[PDB]
Each structure stands twice: as structure tokens, then as C-alpha cells.
């Protein structure tokens, strides 16, 4: 009672019902470094301008 598959049938992506649990960390990766603090707050003008030698702006 066996019927051979047609073209493209054996190349399909199927779905599998299994009972073993998903590996939550399969790459055995350790803890990632903490990111740097980002920019917060509104931008304000520079205090007394450039502060480059004698320039007052």
C-alpha cells in the first residue's frame, strides 16, 4: 500500500511534535558586557562659549 512522493514533496518543510524541551542556551554563551550609558536630557549652550584661550564665544 505504499505510494511514492511526487516532485517537491520530500523537500517540504514539515512540523515536528516532540517532548524534549528546547535548549534555552545552546551556544553555551556567558553573560554579555553591560552597555555604556546613553545620552539623556536637552541640549544647552556651552558655558562661556568655546573656552579656547582668549575667545569669549
Amino acid at each position: 500500500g505504499w505510494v511514492r512522493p511526487d516532485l517537491g514533496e520530500l523537500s517540504k518543510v514539515t512540523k515536528v511534535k516532540t517532548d524534549r524541551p528546547l535548549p534555552e542556551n545552546p551556544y553555551h554563551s556567558r553573560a554579555r558586557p553591560e552597555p555604556n550609558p546613553e545620552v539623556e536630557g536637552d541640549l544647552k549652550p556651552a558655558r562661556h562659549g568655546s573656552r579656547l584661550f582668549f575667545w569669549t564665544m
Partner: protein
Amino acid sequence: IARTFFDAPEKNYERTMAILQIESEKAELRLKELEVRRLMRAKGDGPWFQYPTIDKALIDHSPKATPDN
């Protein structure tokens, strides 16, 4: 002469005080900027001296032709 041309001593006094306050603020800000630059260069945790690295949005995550990867 002192009424027409010259300036009041109080005006020069308070003007000098304003100038001194502004310049002391500028000098303190310059020293703080030097210290901040030294610390950011040494530690590398600040917004400056952030040399670029490889962007991780380029990594392919789809399954490959070989399971061991």
C-alpha cells in the same frame, strides 16, 4: 574731568568682580575637561573615544546546511 570723561571707582570695582568670576569659572571648566578627557581615555566607558567595533546586525541567524554551528 572726573564727571565727564572718567569712570566711577564703584563701576570699575564691580566690573572687575564680574570679570574675575567669569574667568575663574572658565579656568575651573578647563581643568574639569582635562580630567574628564584623561578618565575617558583610561577607562573607555564614556561617550568619547568610542572606537567602532563590528556591528552585530550583520550576523545570519537562519539554519545553515550543517547543524554544528
